[model samples]
Target: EDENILRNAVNLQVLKFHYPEIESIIDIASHVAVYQFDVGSQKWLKTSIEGTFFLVKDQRARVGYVILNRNSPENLYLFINHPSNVHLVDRYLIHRTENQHVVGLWMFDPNDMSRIFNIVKESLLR
Candidate 1:
C-alpha cells in the first residue's frame, strides 16, 4: 500500500509539471476523492476525481463526464457507485456506442483556466 502511494505521488508530480494550471483546480476539489495513475507504460500521468472527470496523457480527456442538471439519468447516472475513483469504469456513451463522441481540450494557454476550471468544478459537483 505504501509503495502504491509513493508511485501515485510521483505520477501526480509528473502531471503537475506537465500541466501546472491544473494544480489549482485540483486543489479546490477538496471534497472529492482524487487519484493518479500511470499510463502509456508509465510514460504519462492521468488524474481523476470521483469517476466524473479525468486528465489523461497531458490532455483533458473527460471520459464519463456529464453536464450537471441536464435532467437525464442516462447521462448522469453512470459510474456513481464506485468507491475508488482510480479504476472506475468509463461509460460516457455506452448506449450509443455506435456514435462517435469526441470530447477533449487542448490546454496549452494559461488564459483558458477559467473555462477549464468551470468544467472541472461542475464535474466535482455532480
Candidate 2:
C-alpha cells in the first residue's frame, strides 16, 4: 500500500511521501494551485510546470528541484515569457544550459522553508 499523503488544495492534487522533510516542502506547494506528483523510485514529489519539474536527488537528501526557463518550447516559456517577473530569473540557480534552461537548489538547512517555498511560488506564478 502507498503511504503517500494525498491532499486537494488550491485546485490542485498533491501527492507526497510520509517523509517529514519532503512533506514540509510539499506543504508549501499545497498553499498554491500547483499540481504535484510522485514519479521516482523513492517517490519524490514532482511538479507540473509547463513541462515536468523533478525534485533533485542528492546525498544530503535535501529538498531541491530542477525547473526549466520559460524560454524553452518544451517548457512553454512559462516563466521566461512572464511580463513582469522576468527579472526574477536571477534568483534561481541554473542547472542545465544547453536546451531548456533548468534551475535547482539544495537546502542544506531543512528549516529554511522560506527558500523552498519561494522557489515553488515562483514556479507556480509562471
Candidate 3:
C-alpha cells in the first residue's frame, strides 16, 4: 500500500516534467482512476490517489478521456471514445495508439502542442 503511493508520486513527477499539460488537463477531469501496469501477472493493479469525484452530480452530456498507461507514462493518448466526438477530429485535427494496440495510432512533433494549441483553441468555435 505505502509502496504504491510512493510509485504514483514518482510516476506523476516523471510525466509532469515533460508534458505538464497532461497533469494540467487531468486536474479538471470529471473523474479519475489511477492504475499501474503489472507485467508479472499480466493484469493491472489499482493504486491509491488522494481524491474522489462525487458520482451523484451528473452534468455533462458526453466527454472523452485521456488514456494513461504506466508502461508509457511519458506518452499521452487522448481517446475520442464517443461517436459524437469523432466529428471534432474529422473536422479539426483530422486525427486519431501500442503492442496489442489499435491501428489508428499516429504520431506528431514532440512537445509541439505549444503551437498546435493555438489551433486547438480555434476548434471551439466550429
Candidate 4:
C-alpha cells in the first residue's frame, strides 16, 4: 500500500523545488530504496525519503533529499496542523547540511509540510 501511495524511484535525479517561501528545502530523497548502508557494520537501512533534490539560496543551492516514510502522512500532518511545530521543521533544514548530498530525513518546513500533508491526507481519506 505504501509503495502504491508514493512514487518509487528506480534511478536518481536532481529534484528541484522552487517554492518562493522555502526554496532551500529541496534535495535528493535517497540514493536507492535502501539509500545507504553502514560500510563497516554492513547494516542496511531503508532511507526515509521517497525522492531527492537540492535547496537553492539566492540562486545558490545545496544538495539535499526528500523523504516519505510509513509515517509521512501523520508526521507531515502534525506539522501542518500545529503552528508551534514550525521550529521543528526548520531544524530539519539545518540538519540537511550534515551531509554533502543533503539527504532530507523525512522532515519539512511548516508551509511545505502543510501543503504536502494535505495532499497525502486527502488521498488517503478519499
Candidate 5:
C-alpha cells in the first residue's frame, strides 16, 4: 500500500499551525481512518480526507506517523485535530521537507504550553 512508502527514511520538515475555526474527530497518526475536505460546504466529509491526513489525541501523546500526499499542492493542508472537548485544531506542516526519508512526532496539546513544551524539551534531552 502507499502507506508503506511513507514509512521509509524521508527527510521531512516539521511545521505548525492553528485552525482556530475548524474542528474534527479523528486522532493523530491514524492510518486506519479517512476523511475528505469539502470545499463547497467548507466542512469535512468523513472519507479519508480525499485519502490524506488527520490527528485527534489527548495528553501523554505518542509520536505518530501521518497519512499525506507527496504531490499535494503547497496550499494543501494537514492538521492534528485535538478533541474539541479539550482543545482546538492544531495543524502541522510537512511542506518541502521530503528527502526520501522519514521519522515521527508526538505533540501534547495542553492548555499550558509552557509546561508541555518543556515535557518534550526535557525528553528530547537527557
Candidate 6:
C-alpha cells in the first residue's frame, strides 16, 4: 500500500503541466460543447465568474480561475454556460484543508482532461 501511494505521488507530479502567464482565448467553432466535472461531499461554497483559470498536464495538478457553486450537474452546466457562452472543455476540483472541506471548480480543455483522467484513473485503480 505504501509503495502504491508513493508511486502514485510521483506519477501525479510527473503528469502535471505548467500554465503560461500570457492569456489567449480559444473560440468554439461548433454549437456542441464538452464539459468537465469535479464531485465533492460539501455544501455552500462560492467563486467568482470573472476570475482567471489555468490547466495542468498532470491529472492531479491544476491551476487558475476559481468559481464556487453547489456541486451539481445543473449548477455545473450553468457555470460552463455562463455569459462567456463558450463551451467548457475541461473542469477541476479546488480543495481546501483548513475548513475541513475541499471545494472549487475550474474550467479547462476537454481533450487534455480526458487524457490526464484516463491515465491517472488507471494507475490508481491498479
Instruction: State the lDDT of candidate 5 residue by residue for 9-93, as single tens digits.
Output: 1213222233222232222232223334444665654432222333322233422223443344332243222211122134322
**Per-candidate count of clashing residue pairs (backbone under 3 Å):** 0, 1, 0, 15, 19, 10
Model 5 misses residue 73 by how many Å?
2.1
Q: Rate the local accuracy (lDDT) of all candidates.
A: 0.31, 0.32, 0.33, 0.30, 0.30, 0.30
lDDT of 6 by residue, 1-126 (tens): 799667545533332322233132111111122222223533443432322222222223222221212242221112121112222232543334343333443434455444433433333342
Give the higher-lDDT candidate: 3 or 5: 3
Worst 10 residues of 1 by lDDT: 91-100
**TM-scores, all models, native as reference:** 0.26, 0.21, 0.27, 0.25, 0.21, 0.24
Q: What CA RMSD would you report for each candidate?
A: 16.8, 14.7, 15.2, 15.9, 14.6, 15.6
Question: What TM-score does prediction 2 earn?
Answer: 0.21
Mind giving the per-residue lDDT tens digits that candidate 1 earns over 1-126? 899667557645544554443332231111222222233343322223232223222124232322212222321212222112322133121112222222222223333334435444455454
When sorted by TM-score, best at the front, the candidate numbers are 3, 1, 4, 6, 2, 5
Strongest candidate by TM-score? 3
Score candidate 6 by lDDT: 0.30
- In candidate 4, residue 29 scores what lDDT? 29
Positional deviation of 85 in candidate 2, in angstroms?
22
Clashing pairs in model 1?
none
Q: In candidate 3, what residue range of length 10 has the lowest lDDT sum?
A: 50-59
Query: What's the lDDT for residue 50 in model 1?
Result: 33
lDDT of 3 by residue, 33-107 (tens): 434445566675544421221111112312223334334433333433323222223212222213332211111
Clashing pairs in 3: none
Give the alpha carbon lDDT tens digit for every residue of 1-126 in model 4. Answer: 576334322211212222333233322223222133444665634455343232222223322223333334311101122222222243232122222322223333445444443343342342
lDDT of 1: 0.31
**Model 2 C-alpha lDDT versus the unseen true structure:** 0.32
lDDT score of residue 88 within candidate 5? 19
